[model samples]
Target: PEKDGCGDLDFDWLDDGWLTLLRRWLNDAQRAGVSEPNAMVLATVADGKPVTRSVLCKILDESGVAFFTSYTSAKGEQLAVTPYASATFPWYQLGRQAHVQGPVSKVSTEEIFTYWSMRPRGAQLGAWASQQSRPVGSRAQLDNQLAEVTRRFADQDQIPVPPGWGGYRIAPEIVEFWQGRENRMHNRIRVANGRLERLQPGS
Candidate 1:
């Protein structure tokens, strides 16, 4: 059975119970050896301007997908001003795609630290070294700065999370799931605010 809303249609097929099954699917796809399985296209709009970038999905939950970046970076600053954002996980290997669009907010500092501590020492040092989206005079200057940070942190067992670095969760207001079908009559479904809705291609 299926339903329609606002130019969209949805199936009662998996609305309530598909989450667990989809999770298993995602894990299986991940295990199937797709390189960069967690990669997604992230879009953020700020000051009436929109920017897109590819960022790895570090975490996913009932809330949303999370990725860390410098709060002072262009994307971060833009998102801070305008909290709305969107992301698309292109699971081409599984013939599926999940797109989410919604508001965003920073994750807690504790949450930031938890992930920061798990990052490799080189990544930690790189995060500390970068002023992200800030201008650098030249490659040499940047390399020098990185070397300085590496030297300064050489004694630390765990690098501290940079105060300017943190993560954002795109708490989706709407999520669309698309499945490829033969002859281009694909299957698409969406869930928003506890309600299931159908999505028509190009509508």
Candidate 2:
């Protein structure tokens, strides 16, 4: 059947069905050995130009989609100016993609700390080693920075989390699901304001 993977996605159900559907798609992708199933590309605007970068979906729920990064990074600076952004989960292996767009807000400090606790010490040290968005002069300098932070944190039980390191959550106004079909004709379904609407495909 065309546009068929699991089954028809019914948005009119009594529950907020999007999460379940998307979660299933993600799970399937994971089981298929698609590494980094939670990765999603985030889009933001800065200097009047649209910019995008890949960020892992660290948080997903009925309310918001979230990811973490350095607050002083390029994307972070962009989000600081424009509080709204879009993100997409492109599961090519599953012939599906999930799109989310809406207002972005910084997650609470507590939430940031909680996530930080789970991070590997190496990454934690790297985060402190270099300032994101700023260019490093050379590879040697980068290595030097890493070694410096490594040596500096050797005696300490924990590497200090950078003040600028945290996360942002997007409160979705429109959440869209795309299911690929043959001949480039695909299904485009989007939900906004508690209503699911079909969007024109291959346009």
Candidate 3:
């Protein structure tokens, strides 16, 4: 059987302000998050085949979780067609994980500019240079493109943000947390909207 309280099990004292706890938890969870700790596994379909990959998390909030991708990429195409997505943050070392599933939407233009300003010049230039998940004949081609961008913008004070680059936020209908335990006993607490209950499951 699972121990009733091995981790931060006493969520009773938690409140909206307890977001401090959640942020701290995110830090702890991020420490345990593998490969790219900020990375989330994405599920999308392309060419009749299921596709998956790691995408870095850019923002998190009560509204939803957000990231950036090329609207013309495989995942982007899938999202455009399907309009929904799923994300998983695996803190396996801490024996905890978070899952969210919901509709995906492009971030606002204001949001795009707001976030774009934070990116470094090289990244911004790369964003403009990359056609994204498209065929490129050689590494030299990208290097040459980057070089071209360097020369083209050398005299300019600011590099313009590319229109093709922006962000996407997944507004989830379900958000779940999982905790591990000995002997296969685990804890799962999830908030879902399908039920008609006043507070729902985790709320």
Residue by residue across 63-172, what tens digits does model 3's lDDT show?
A: 68889877767778888778788888776666667677788889988887877888887787878777666578999988888888778888975788765777788886
TM-scores of the candidates in the order shown: 0.86, 0.91, 0.79
Off by more than 4 A, model 1: 1-22
Comparing 2 and 3 by TM-score, which wins? Answer: 2
Candidate 3 scores a C-alpha RMSD against the true structure in Å of 4.7
What value of lDDT does candidate 3 attain over all alpha carbons? 0.69
lDDT-sorted candidate list, best first = 2, 1, 3
Q: Tell me the deviation in Å of residue 115 in model 2.
A: 0.3
Judged by TM-score, which candidate is best?
A: 2
Poorly placed runs, candidate 3 (over 4 Å): 1-24, 30-35, 47-49, 194-203
Indicate whether candidate 2 or candidate 3 has the larger lDDT.
Answer: 2
Compose the digit string of candidate 1's lDDT tens values, residues 1-203.
12111222237556454355346546756887777878889988866777899988787777777898888888787887888899997877666677888889889888888988889887889888996666788999999989999899889887887878889998867877776654455678777767776666654
Better of 1 and 3 by lDDT: 1
The backbone clash count of each candidate, in order, is 3, 0, 0
